[PDB]
Every structure is written in structure tokens, then in C-alpha cells.
Design an enzyme around this catalytic site. Structure first.
Site, PDB file in Angstrom:
ATOM      1  N   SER A 240       1.768   8.806   5.031  1.00  0.00           N
ATOM      2  CA  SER A 240       1.071   8.869   3.751  1.00  0.00           C
ATOM      3  C   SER A 240       2.107   9.296   2.718  1.00  0.00           C
ATOM      4  O   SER A 240       2.482  10.470   2.664  1.00  0.00           O
ATOM      5  CB  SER A 240      -0.101   9.833   3.803  1.00  0.00           C
ATOM      6  OG  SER A 240      -0.893   9.722   2.638  1.00  0.00           O
ATOM      7  N   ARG A 241       2.565   8.346   1.912  1.00  0.00           N
ATOM      8  CA  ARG A 241       3.625   8.618   0.954  1.00  0.00           C
ATOM      9  C   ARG A 241       3.132   9.529  -0.160  1.00  0.00           C
ATOM     10  O   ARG A 241       3.925   9.998  -0.983  1.00  0.00           O
ATOM     11  CB  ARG A 241       4.173   7.309   0.395  1.00  0.00           C
ATOM     12  CG  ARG A 241       4.735   6.408   1.474  1.00  0.00           C
ATOM     13  CD  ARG A 241       5.651   5.346   0.915  1.00  0.00           C
ATOM     14  NE  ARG A 241       4.984   4.051   0.838  1.00  0.00           N
ATOM     15  CZ  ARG A 241       4.647   3.322   1.897  1.00  0.00           C
ATOM     16  NH1 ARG A 241       4.917   3.755   3.122  1.00  0.00           N
ATOM     17  NH2 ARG A 241       4.044   2.154   1.737  1.00  0.00           N
ATOM     18  N   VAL A 242       1.828   9.779  -0.205  1.00  0.00           N
ATOM     19  CA  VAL A 242       1.282  10.818  -1.071  1.00  0.00           C
ATOM     20  C   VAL A 242       1.396  12.186  -0.417  1.00  0.00           C
ATOM     21  O   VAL A 242       1.926  13.130  -1.006  1.00  0.00           O
ATOM     22  CB  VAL A 242      -0.177  10.482  -1.430  1.00  0.00           C
ATOM     23  CG1 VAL A 242      -0.852  11.671  -2.064  1.00  0.00           C
ATOM     24  CG2 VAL A 242      -0.221   9.286  -2.352  1.00  0.00           C
TER      25      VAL A 242
ATOM     26  N   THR B 178       0.819  -1.201   0.000  1.00  0.00           N
ATOM     27  CA  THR B 178       0.000   0.000   0.000  1.00  0.00           C
ATOM     28  C   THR B 178       0.860   1.261   0.000  1.00  0.00           C
ATOM     29  O   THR B 178       2.087   1.213  -0.086  1.00  0.00           O
ATOM     30  CB  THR B 178      -0.940  -0.013   1.199  1.00  0.00           C
ATOM     31  OG1 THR B 178      -0.172  -0.066   2.403  1.00  0.00           O
ATOM     32  CG2 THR B 178      -1.862  -1.209   1.134  1.00  0.00           C
ATOM     33  N   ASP B 179       0.194   2.412   0.098  1.00  0.00           N
ATOM     34  CA  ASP B 179       0.816   3.719  -0.069  1.00  0.00           C
ATOM     35  C   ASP B 179       0.900   4.505   1.229  1.00  0.00           C
ATOM     36  O   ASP B 179       1.323   5.663   1.214  1.00  0.00           O
ATOM     37  CB  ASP B 179       0.046   4.531  -1.105  1.00  0.00           C
ATOM     38  CG  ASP B 179       0.321   4.076  -2.515  1.00  0.00           C
ATOM     39  OD1 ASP B 179      -0.485   3.296  -3.055  1.00  0.00           O
ATOM     40  OD2 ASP B 179       1.346   4.500  -3.087  1.00  0.00           O
TER      41      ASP B 179
END
Ligand code: ATP
Ligand code: ADP
Ligand code: MG
Ligand code: MG
Lengths: 188, 47, 469, 508
Positions: free
Chosen positions: D371-373, D345-346
Site C-alpha cells: 500500500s503505497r499510502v 493503482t496505488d
């Protein structure tokens, strides 16, 4: 599924399953004697050194083996049952245990015709009259129509007496066991 | 692998028993003091 | 139909049929046994063989023994005539009192209620236990769990609940003892006879018992839960009435399932458990439910092997329960009984809109103060109590008072403690804890709160302690 | 050696030439049945993962195609299946209905209504095992997926087309995060903006039916079913249904993604789909690996989660956010399935039980959450306030050990502790009470500019409430400006300053 007719004596293993299939197939259509004779025939046919060498090599394709076996079966004019059995053993690659299948069917057919294998063990050989009374009494053990299949081995390891096996029944009138029994009970 | 609150007394090693005793002795002392005060109040409030 | 045993290995019997096979889960009866041995079909192995688990000892079975096919799963007697009796997995009575004379037999295997039958209403069930009522309140028709290792109070707590709820409960009740000591089964039988819920003279019994204790082979332990569940299901549907259902323990069902899986040819899973652990447990826990036709209040005792709450069995059981009360050994060592862990217990109805804002706020204040106490205990291990901020000592004092005040004497634990049982109404528990938090008792000593009922009893105990000081 | 089709019945059939009257291409005869796995002889023209239908009305999925036999997994109890039965091909891989006809309907893993509201519309069908998009169709995640939770929207932003992960222990609030996210979307769905509407899918794997019934009641109460699908695969369901339900949900959501709309799918719980697959694999005698899980269990979850994409305007622009839920046992994020799905997941919203009982509910543990976003999935105003909030919280987390001592320390540490405590008391939220983004930004703006350094921490939860009600009632123009505009303009900043000061000027 088709309700196969069970054999008298249950043989187990790969040979057991193939032989039970053959016995169920033959019992309906009533071809047990002919199929047993054909099995005895293939017992020698495949045993031929050339055929054996050509069927124990797993690098000849199953196609070639099946074709050769079809040719042999046609050349021998077998029942469709035995031809199909040989084809089935060839497709599944079970030729190396074909003699096991023939032996299993032999054991299975012997019980079908009412035979109870017997064994007699003594220190020394026997006089034919005594063997005759043994035949009579052992036939007394059996049931109606159950032929007997006597085997008289000679075991000098025992010190005398007699040992009799009739199927799973066993009677030990041997000197050695009674010596052992007395020695043990007396030792206590 | 992390650490969480109230873990010293979860292990139950030497520090766990040491802490348990350090707590129990103090609160036994305070309970004794409070019981003395309660007795004094009882006596002083009879009338 | 008639078949023929062809293998016996442990508790697993392989039976061969010459006619048509029997369907899976059918009951087969072995012919030639002095007692009644019932096998249950579990697999079709081909070649007309079926594997089965025996519901009794497989000693003295002979390869070739004939077997009859009943044609239906194990069918137990059900009805008001089973009340006051005792039963096996296969429904025959073991109270030495004669046959159970019913008109209805119910198969122990059934499908779970469908989604269009679920009740969605929750209302607190007041049990009279301070910790349970405050922090993990139960609910009518909901499934309750009692986790904890060995020797923490599962059986005592469940007996206490039977003492309170069942005695003053109009509806019927069922107790399925699954894989537990037979001594305890006899003790419960006699305690119930004494109390009067089981009446051996009249037809006024209010409890039906089913016993599969730990001397039975795995086949019987894996199915006595289904037998008790069937009795409860009948009382739920046909009688159209409230039911209670106590089980002790529902870990022995899983374990008994695990003792035969390897012999049925299944590869094991994470920790020597059967691959079908979750499915096997779900197909049972999904029939213990409050449909719209009836209402089962299910209390379950769940052994936690070696206090490990992360074991697959309790871990999986957690998801099937509304309320949980995780009894803890670390709290039972301290002498706080029942050893219910206040921070590791939960309930679904524990919301401000179901219990009320006062109840909810008191519960959350208690939990927060206990967690802060746990945080402080690490520091006290180095500094010492003498070096804490004069506010922290207040937190520690309140936390210890609250820790002791959750302890309570049961009417069934008179023998151990020697004290007398107390039932605390919910309002009194809320008042007691709200006052203890508010500081209205920060002068009474801690021990005044230990093993008492309402708060006034703590005041009286403190008064006595002071007088004989 | 030995085969499972070498039973004496098949050999008997084949010896006397009875194998020619049986159609072994589209039909088969069950050789074995047990523990939900049937081994079928025949079906020579059956495809992997194709659906076969047993004589007794049951269905099954043919997973293991071996030379001798076919290993079918039954979709229900194997009580009805007996050795010798007849199994017929269906001809098609498993697929499910899709469309807006599912919204507000509870369905099972195969698209059959189970709420008793009548048949299901179902104009279109879709195969559950469809490959995800590629490198090119996607574009970077830019839009925000408003969770309505202050912590998640402030410090763990979730975009659209992102795969977050609500990882936590038992009874920490994971389903509550999911339900608050589902319920907060009503303010967008009710409105008219067609690019903000989010349709929700809730996959319920392995939960008991009472839980799902209560959840559906909760959604109906909040009037949040008219745009929600619920796909139930409860505990009583056979292992194949629990295994498929995530894929049925993902395809019902891929429908919305492919048609320009936006969807949110909440696989709750994935750690139970893994268990169901483990059962099926172990009963099919497949080689086990770590913890008895099959080898291709990373594949099982990756091919599921990689279907959460943000298509580009050349494909429609739709998207499918995924919020898989996983239950770690003690705290072990290093176990097998938690590891796999953390690496797939991200991001992750990491929930705690220490924080749950310390009063910090929702128990989102920042510092472990990520949250890599990141900021790319936030609005400009939320960015402005959340940068400072995150910086201050990070400063507070490295001096939180002193929180007990606090005094007898420099003034900087005192200020850090005070600001951190105020901020943590700010991130506290109720239950089922999401907040619009303007509300969140107003509250956090008040918090992070020092306007609460005077209030006592116990009073911050009451301030937040009263101040929020105030601004929501008196000042709608400012909130509307922030909302539609998306940023905090200088005039709006001044208005927020004056509002916060005036309300705080007298609070008592
Ligand atoms: N922010 C919150 N404020 C107050 N209560 C909360 C909050 N979040 C969760 N809860 C409560 O905590 C309890 C457990 O939450 P929830 O069931 O959502 O967690 P969970 O991890 O999904 O549980 P499980 O995983 O065992 O199903 C619920 O009763 C819920 O009402
Ligand atoms: N309410 C209680 N008060 C005092 N002691 C208790 C109480 N409950 C359990 N115990 C202790 O636990 C023991 C019984 O534990 P029990 O609950 O039967 O074991 P388990 O919970 O493992 O089945 C008793 O010997 C007793 O000392
Ligand atoms: Mg016990
Ligand atoms: Mg949940």
C-alpha cells in the site's frame, strides 16, 4: 431499402456494383437504351487526351473534377441518370475505372437484349456456306429470341476439327483432343 | 516468476521420480511391518 | 420468402434474397437436397445477402440453389414424447424409430431468465462419491463442472453420476452429447436401455437424448447444446418439475464456434478463439439456471486443452459454475480414481452454515493435510523419508492414507478395475475422514484404504491383507 | 479499394435522385448487422459515443465514425435489427441516474432497476464519460477506510480516495474481501458520525445472475443494502453493457464524492470489462495489440480508476475509494491487463491458493501485498501495534524456510519462528465477520507483546475468539476510549496489559 431490379448477368467488383446500380436505376423509368447510348458517348468524351490528362491527376481537387464533369454533361445534354452516375463516380474518385463501368454495362445490356456470345476455333478459315450452316445449327442450340454473337478465331495449334463455345456450353470436335485421348487410353 | 509448494513432483524430472521412489520404498517397508504386527495381534486375540 | 445461394465456403453459405431479408438466427431450408439441410442466419452483409452457418454438410450445393425461409429459429419437438428418443440439432430423430409426435415445438434460441427469477436456496446433493461429497459437495439446482484434460475420467464420472442420481431421481433427465465420440453415444444408448431409464416398449422413459457428435460440421456442434438446453428448459417450465441436464463436453460448443468465426470475417482473439467467446458462452450458460418456476441440475464436462486450466475456454467457463471438480492427470497416473483434485475443486455451498461444522471442519482438515504433504514432498526429494521429524512422518502417513481413501470403485468402471461399485453415504465419508485424521487408523497399512467404500471396508481389506501375509 | 457504403443500394438511390427525400443528418439506414455490431448509413450529425435508437426499440452507442458509415454497438441481441432498419439520434451522450434513490436497489449498466421493486427515483442524471478531477482539487489520503479484516487493516492499510487492487487467482477470496469491506461499514452508517459513513457500490461485470442474487441475499441478511448500490452487467448482457457498467458505477459514486459524502466502488471484475472491450474493438475491425487487446486498453482503465479521488475541503471533502478486482490466471501478474492495472493503482492485496489451503484464510499474501499510502491511512493505535506486527512478520518471512527444521537452530531463530506462527494464526479471520478497529487493535496488541508465546498455535484461534468476546462484554469503557480517542493512551495501555494478563492468567 429500395428493391433494385437485378441485372441478367451479375458483374462483380467495383465496376459491377456501380453498373448494377445504374442498371437498376434505368430499368425503372425504362431508360436502358438511351442510357447505354449516353454511356457509349461518355466513353469517348472522357477519353479525350486533355480530359483524360486532367482526370487522371489526383492533385486536381475532387471539387474541380466534379465541376468540369458537370459542365461537360450540361454541354452534352445527358439524361439525369448518366449525369448523376458520372457525378457519383467523380465524388468517390472512381474515374480511373469508368471504362470498366461502361464495359460492365455493355455486357449487362447485351444479355438484356438476349445475346449469347459464341466462339468457333479451327485450324484454318471457313467457307461462307459452312459458316452459314454453323449459324443455323448454333441458333438451334439457343432458345427463343436469343440472338447469337459469333466469333470465329483461327487456332492452328489444334491439328484440325472444330471447337465451339456457346455461353458456358462447350463442344470439342478437334483433332488435337482426340489424338490426346487415344494416346492416353492406349498408353494405359 | 515465483515458486510454490509441491513443485518438485510437478515438474516430474529426475528429482520427482527419485522422491516418489524414496517415499514408496519407505512406506512399503512400514506397511510390511504393520501387517506383521496386525497378523500377530490377530493370532494373539483369537482366544 | 425465397432466396438463392450465392457462395459456399467450407461450412459458411452466403444466401441472397430478392424479397425482404430474414432476421438473424432464422432457419433456412435448402431446396434440392435428398436429406434436410438447414442453414442458420448469422449476419446481414448488405446488398440483400445474408451469411449463414450450415447445420449439415454443404457438399453438392450449387451457386443458385433456391432457399426457403422458415420464418422462425430452429424449432425442435418438445414434450414428454421426446423422452427415450434421440435427436439432431434440428430435432429430427436419429434412433430409427419413427417421427416424434408432439404438439409443441420450441425455438432453440431464447432469452435468459431475468434477475427477478433467480432462486437463492442451496442444499447439498449427495452423489455417493467420497471426494465430491466431502470437498466439493454439489447442490440441487446448481451448475456443476467437471474439468480435466483427455483421459482423466470425465466421461466415466458423468456416466457414474447418471447411474446414481438419474436412476433414483423422480423428475426427468436430459443428455446432450456435444461433439463427443459416437461410440460413446451408442454405448450410453445401450447402457440406458439395459438399465431401464430408456424403455422402447412403454411410455415410461425418463431420459431424452440429443446428439451432435464430432462427425458433424461446426454448425451442428455449436447448436446441439442449445437443442438439449431447449428440451431441458421446457421440462423445467411447462412440466414444472425437477430436471437434470448432462452435457459432454461443453468445450466443443466453444470450439465449434471457433471453427467458423474466421470465415465469418471476425479477427481472432487471444489464442485462435473467436472474439465473442465469453458472450457466446454466456448467452448459453445463462439459460441453464434454477428459476423460481423449475429447477435444472446441470452437470457439464469441460475439456481442458492440454491440461491447461488457464486456457481461455475453461478459464471463462469457471465463472459460470457453482461447483467444480477439477480432475487431474497427475493424480490419475497414481491410480487414484476418480482423479478429482482435492485442492483444485470448490463448491459454493462449502460453508459451515450450509453443510455443518463437522463436515466443514473435516473437509478443511483434509485439504490442509494434503497441502502440508505437498510442502513436505519437496524436502523428501533431498533428505529422504528416513530423515524427517518423527512428527512429519505422521503427516505423510496420514496424507497418503487420505489420498488413497478418496479413491472409490464405480459401478460403471467394473470393466477396468474388475472391482464392485460402492455408494458411500455422506455420514460415512465424514466419519471415515474424521477418524483417519484423528489417528484411529495409524497402524493399518496404506494399501488397505485403496479403492474401498466406507472405512470399515478398509479395515476388512487390511484384515484380509494380514491373513494372507 | 472499397467502401462499405458503396453497396449498389446506396448508389442506386443516389443515381436517380432519391437521396434528397431521406434525412441523412438525424437518421440512418442500417447497412450491415452482425455479432452485435451494426454499420449504419447516414447520421451525419452524430457525435462520437452518442446513443442512437433503432427502429425496433433497441439502443446503441455510435463508436466508429468513418467517412462512409457509423459503427454502432447494439445494447442487446442483434436478432431484432435487420439491414435497412431506421436509426434515430437520441442527441445526448450516454448518462445514468444518480442520487440516494439508488441505495438498496439493484440496477443494470444503464440505471434501470432489475430487482422488480418499482421505478427508480432518479432526480439527477450524470454522464458516465466525465473527466476525473485534476492535480489541485485532491489532497493527500489521510482518513482510513476500515475494511474490517485484520490483515488488510494491519499490514495493507487502505485510505479514502485510494485505489487498492484485490488481485488474485480464481476462488481465492476476492469477492469475500469486497463483501466483508461492504458489510463492515454498517457500524459507521448506523451511527451518527456523518464523516465516517461510507456508501458502497458493487459493480458486477460478467458474473452469472445466480451469483449476484446470492450476493444480494448475503448483503440483505447483514442489513447492508440500505446503503449499497449493485450494478449488474452479467454474462448474458451485451458486450457494451459489460463495458459501460464500471463507468455507470463510477458516476453513481462520483455523485456522492461531489456532494461531500464518501463512497466505495468495487469494480468486480475488471478483467471482464477488458474482455468485453476487446470483443467490441475486434468486431469494429480496430487494430489489435498484445493478446488481441486494442491499443487503448490502458486508457480504458486509467480514465476509469483515476476518478477515485479525495476532494479537498474547498470542493466538499468527499471521496471515492476504488477496489478493482482482477483475476490472474496462474500467478501471472506480468500479463497485459494485470500489468496495466498494477501500474495504474496505488497498491495491491495479493491473494493465494497455497495460503488458502494451508489454513490462512483470508489468503492475503503479505510481502507481495503493498500500500503505497501506508501508515497515512491508519489510526494512531493501529499504527502503534501494526508497526511492530509488520516488522516481526517481515523477520519471520525470511526464516520461514527453516520452519520445518526449526529445532537445531539458534534461539533467535526459534523465537522468530514462534512469534511469526502466533502472528499468522492471529491474522486468520472468519467469513462475513468483520471486526471494529478497537477489536483488531486489542487482538494484535495481545499478539505482538508476547502474551501468546506460551499458548500452542492450535489454540490461538480459540484464544483470539474467547478473549475478544471477553473484552467486548466486560470492558466497553476501554474499547470506547480507544475508539473515540483514536490512540492508546498510557492508562489505556496499562488497562490492556492488565486485561490481557488477567484473561491469559487462566485460559485452559
Ligand atoms: N476468510 C475466509 N474464511 C473461510 N472461507 C473463505 C474465506 N474467504 C473466502 N472463503 C471461501 O472461499 C470460497 C471462494 O471465495 P470467493 O468466491 O470470495 O473467491 P473469488 O476469488 O471471488 O471466487 P471467484 O473469483 O471465482 O468468484 C467461498 O466459498 C468462500 O466462502
Ligand atoms: N473410475 C475409474 N476407474 C478406473 N479407471 C478409470 C476410471 N475412470 C476412467 N478411467 C480410465 O480412463 C479411461 C476412460 O477415460 P474417459 O473418462 O472416457 O476420458 P475423458 O475423461 O477424457 O472423456 C479408461 O480407459 C480408464 O482406464
Ligand atoms: Mg469423453
Ligand atoms: Mg468472486
Amino acid at each position: 431499402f429500395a428493391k433494385l431490379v437485378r441485372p441478367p448477368v451479375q458483374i462483380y467488383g467495383i465496376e459491377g456494383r456501380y453498373a448494377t446500380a445504374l442498371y437498376s436505376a434505368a430499368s425503372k423509368q425504362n431508360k436502358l437504351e438511351q442510357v447505354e447510348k449516353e454511356l457509349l458517348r461518355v466513353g469517348q468524351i472522357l477519353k479525350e487526351p486533355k480530359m483524360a490528362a486532367s482526370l487522371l491527376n489526383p492533385y486536381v481537387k475532387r471539387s474541380v473534377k466534379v465541376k468540369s464533369l458537370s459542365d461537360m454533361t450540361a454541354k452534352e445534354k445527358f439524361s439525369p441518370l448518366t449525369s448523376n452516375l458520372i457525378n457519383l463516380l467523380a465524388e468517390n474518385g472512381r474515374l480511373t475505372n469508368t471504362p470498366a463501368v461502361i464495359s460492365a454495362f455493355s455486357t449487362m445490356m447485351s444479355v438484356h437484349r438476349g445475346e449469347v456470345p459464341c466462339t468457333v476455333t479451327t485450324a484454318s478459315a471457313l467457307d461462307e456456306a459452312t459458316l452459314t450452316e454453323l449459324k443455323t445449327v448454333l441458333k438451334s442450340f439457343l432458345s427463343k429470341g436469343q440472338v447469337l454473337k459469333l466469333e470465329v478465331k483461327i487456332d492452328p495449334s489444334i491439328m484440325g476439327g472444330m471447337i465451339v463455345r456457346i455461353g458456358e456450353k462447350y463442344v470439342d470436335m478437334s483433332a488435337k483432343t482426340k489424338i490426346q485421348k487415344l494416346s492416353r487410353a492406349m498408353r494405359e | 516468476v515465483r515458486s510454490s509448494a509441491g513443485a518438485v513432483r510437478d515438474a516430474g524430472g529426475a528429482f520427482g521420480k527419485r522422491e516418489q521412489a524414496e517415499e514408496e520404498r519407505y512406506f512399503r517397508a512400514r506397511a510390511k511391518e504393520q501387517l506383521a504386527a496386525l497378523k500377530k495381534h490377530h493370532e494373539n486375540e483369537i482366544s | 420468402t425465397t432466396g438463392r445461394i450465392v457462395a459456399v465456403i467450407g461450412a459458411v453459405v452466403d444466401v441472397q434474397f430478392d424479397e425482404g431479408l430474414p432476421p438473424i438466427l432464422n432457419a433456412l431450408e435448402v431446396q434440392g437436397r435428398e436429406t434436410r439441410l438447414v442453414l442458420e442466419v448469422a449476419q446481414h452483409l448488405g446488398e440483400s445477402t445474408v451469411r449463414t452457418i450450415a447445420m449439415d454438410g454443404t457438399e453438392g450445393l450449387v451457386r443458385g440453389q433456391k432457399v426457403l425461409d422458415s420464418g422462425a429459429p430452429i424449432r425442435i419437438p418438445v414434450g414428454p414424447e421426446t423422452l427415450g428418443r434421440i435427436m439432431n440439432v434440428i430435432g429430427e430423430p436419429i434412433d430409427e424409430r419413427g417421427p416424434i409426435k408432439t404438439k409443441q415445438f420450441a425455438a432453440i434460441h431464447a432469452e435468459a431468465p431475468e434477475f427477478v427469477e433467480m432462486s437463492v436456496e442451496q442444499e447439498i446433493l449427495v452423489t455417493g462419491i467420497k471426494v465430491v461429497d466431502l470437498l466439493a459437495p454439489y447442490a440441487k439446482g446448481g451448475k456443476i463442472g467437471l474439468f480435466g484434460g483427455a483421459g482423466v475420467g470425465k466421461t466415466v464420472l458423468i456416466m457414474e453420476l447418471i447411474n446414481n442420481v438419474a436412476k433414483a431421481h423422480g423428475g426427468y433427465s436430459v443428455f446432450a452429447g456435444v461433439g463427443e465420440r459416437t461410440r460413446e453415444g451408442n454405448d450410453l444408448y445401450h447402457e440406458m436401455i439395459e438399465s431401464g431409464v430408456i424403455n422402447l416398449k412403454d411410455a415410461t422413459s425418463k431420459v431424452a437424448l440429443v446428439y451432435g457428435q464430432m462427425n458433424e460440421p461446426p454448425g451442428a456442434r455449436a447448436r446441439v447444446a442449445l437443442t438439449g438446453l431447449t428440451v431441458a428448459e421446457y421440462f423445467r417450465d411447462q412440466e414444472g418439475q425437477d430436471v437434470l441436464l448432462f452435457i459432454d463436453n461443453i468445450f466443443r460448443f466453444t470450439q465449434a464456434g471457433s471453427e467458423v468465426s474466421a470465415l465469418l470475417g471476425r479477427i481472432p482473439s487471444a489464442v485462435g478463439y473467436q472474439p465473442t467467446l465469453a458472450t457466446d458462452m454466456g448467452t448459453m450458460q445463462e439459460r441453464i439456471t434454477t428459476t423460481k418456476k423449475g429447477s435444472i441440475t446441470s452437470v457439464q464436462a469441460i475439456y481442458v486443452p492440454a491440461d491447461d486450466l488457464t486456457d481461455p475456454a475453461p478459464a471463462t467457463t469457471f465463472a459460470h459454475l457453482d461447483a467444480t471438480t477439477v480432475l487431474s492427470r497427475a493424480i490419475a497416473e497414481l491410480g487414484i480414481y476418480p482423479a478429482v483434485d482435492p485442492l483444485d475443486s470448490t463448491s459454493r455451498i462449502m460453508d459451515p452454515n450450509i453443510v455443518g461444522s463437522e463436515h466443514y471442519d473435516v473437509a478443511r482438515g483434509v485439504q490442509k493435510i494434503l497441502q502440508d504433504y505437498k510442502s513436505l514432498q519437496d524436502i523428501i526429494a533431498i533428505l529422504g523419508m528416513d530423515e524427517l521429524s518423527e512428527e512429519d512422518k505422521l503427516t505423510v502417513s496420514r496424507a497418503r492414507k487420505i489420498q488413497r481413501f478418496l479413491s472409490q470403485p464405480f459401478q460403471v468402471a467394473e470393466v477396468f478395475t474388475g472391482h464392485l461399485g460402492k455408494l458411500v453415504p455422506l455420514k460415512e465419508t465424514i466419519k471415515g475422514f474424521q477418524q483417519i485424521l484423528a489417528g484411529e487408523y495409524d497402524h493399518l497399512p496404506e494399501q488397505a484404504f485403496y479403492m474401498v467404500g466406507p472405512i470399515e471396508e478398509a479395515v476388512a481389506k487390511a484384515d484380509k491383507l494380514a491373513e494372507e501375509h | 479499394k472499397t467502401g462499405t457504403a458503396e453497396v449498389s443500394s446506396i448508389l442506386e438511390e443516389r443515381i436517380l435522385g432519391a437521396d434528397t427525400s431521406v434525412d441523412l443528418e438525424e437518421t440512418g439506414r442500417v447497412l450491415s448487422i452482425g455479432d452485435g455490431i451494426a454499420r449504419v448509413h447516414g447520421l451525419r450529425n452524430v457525435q462520437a459515443e452518442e446513443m442512437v435508437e433503432f427502429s425496433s426499440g433497441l439502443k446503441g452507442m455510435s463508436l466508429n465514425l468513418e467517412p462512409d458509415n457509423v459503427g454502432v454497438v447494439v445494447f442487446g441481441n442483434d436478432k431484432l435489427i435487420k439491414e435497412g432498419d431506421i436509426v434515430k439520434r437520441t442527441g445526448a451522450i450516454v448518462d445514468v441516474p444518480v442520487g440516494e434513490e439508488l441505495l438498496g436497489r439493484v440496477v443494470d449498466a444503464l440505471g434501470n432497476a432489475i430487482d422488480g421493486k418499482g421505478p427508480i427515483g432518479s432526480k439527477a442524471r450524470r454522464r458516465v464519460g466525465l473527466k476525473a478531477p485534476g492535480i489541485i482539487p485532491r489532497i493527500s489520503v489521510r482518513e482510513p477506510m476500515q475494511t474490517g479484516i485484520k490483515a488488510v487493516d494491519s499490514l495493507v492499510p487502505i485510505g479514502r480516495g485510494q485505489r487498492e487492487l484485490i488481485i488474485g487467482d480464481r476462488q481465492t477470496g476476492k469477492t469475500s474481501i469486497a463483501i466483508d469491506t461492504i458489510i463492515n461499514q454498517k457500524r459507521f452508517n448506523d451511527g451518527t458520525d456523518e464523516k465516517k459513513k461510507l456508501y458502497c457500490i458493487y459493480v458486477a461485470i460478467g458474473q452469472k445472475r445466480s451469483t449476484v442474487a446470492q450476493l444480494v441475499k448475503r448483503l440483505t441478511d447483514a442489513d447492508a443494502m440500505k446503503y449499497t448500490i449493485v450494478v449488474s452487467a452479467t454474462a448474458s448482457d451485451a458486450a457494451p453493457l459489460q463495458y459501460l457498467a464500471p463507468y455507470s458505477g463510477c458516476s453513481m459514486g462520483e455523485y456522492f464524492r461531489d456532494n461531500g459524502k464518501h463512497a466505495l466502488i468495487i469494480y468486480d471484475d475488471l478483467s471482464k470489462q477488458a474482455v468485453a472491450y476487446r470483443q467490441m474493438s475486434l468486431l469494429l475491425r480496430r487494430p489489435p495489440g498484445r493478446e488481441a487487446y486494442p491499443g487503448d486498453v490502458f486508457y480504458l482503465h486509467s480514465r476509469l480508476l483515476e476518478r477515485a479521488a479525495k476532494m479537498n475541503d474547498a470542493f466538499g471533502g468527499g471521496s471515492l475509494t476504488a477496489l478493482p478486482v482482477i483475476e490472474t490466471q496462474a500467478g501471472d501478474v506480468s500479463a497485459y491487463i494485470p500489468t496495466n492495472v498494477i501500474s495504474i493503482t496505488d497498491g495491491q492485496i495479493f491473494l493465494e491458493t497455497e495460503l488458502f489451503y494451508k489454513g490462512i484464510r483470508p489468503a492475503i499474501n503479505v510481502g507481495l501485498s503493498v500500500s503505497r499510502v501506508g501508515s497515512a491511512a491508519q489510526t494512531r493505535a493501529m499504527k502503534q501495534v501494526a508497526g511492530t506486527m509488520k516488522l516481526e512478520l517481515a523477520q519471520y518471512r525470511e526464516v520461514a524456510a527453516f520452519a520445518q527444521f526449526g529445532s537445531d537452530l539458534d534461539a533467535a531463530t526459534q523465537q522468530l519462528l514462534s512469534r511469526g506462527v502466533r502472528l499468522t494464526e492471529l491474522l486468520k479471520q472468519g467469513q462475513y465477520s468483520p471486526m471494529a478497529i478497537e477489536e483488531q487493535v486489542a487482538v494484535i496488541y495481545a499478539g505482538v507483546r508476547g502474551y501468546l508465546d506460551k499458548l500452542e498455535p492450535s489454540k490461538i484461534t480459540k484464544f483470539e475468539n474467547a478473549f475478544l468476546s471477553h473484552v467486548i462484554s466486560q470492558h466497553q469503557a476501554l474499547l470506547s476510549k480507544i475508539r473515540t480517542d483514536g490512540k492508546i493512551s498510557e492508562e489505556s495501555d496499562a488497562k490492556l496489559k492488565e486485561i490481557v494478563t488477567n484473561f491469559l492468567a487462566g485460559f485452559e
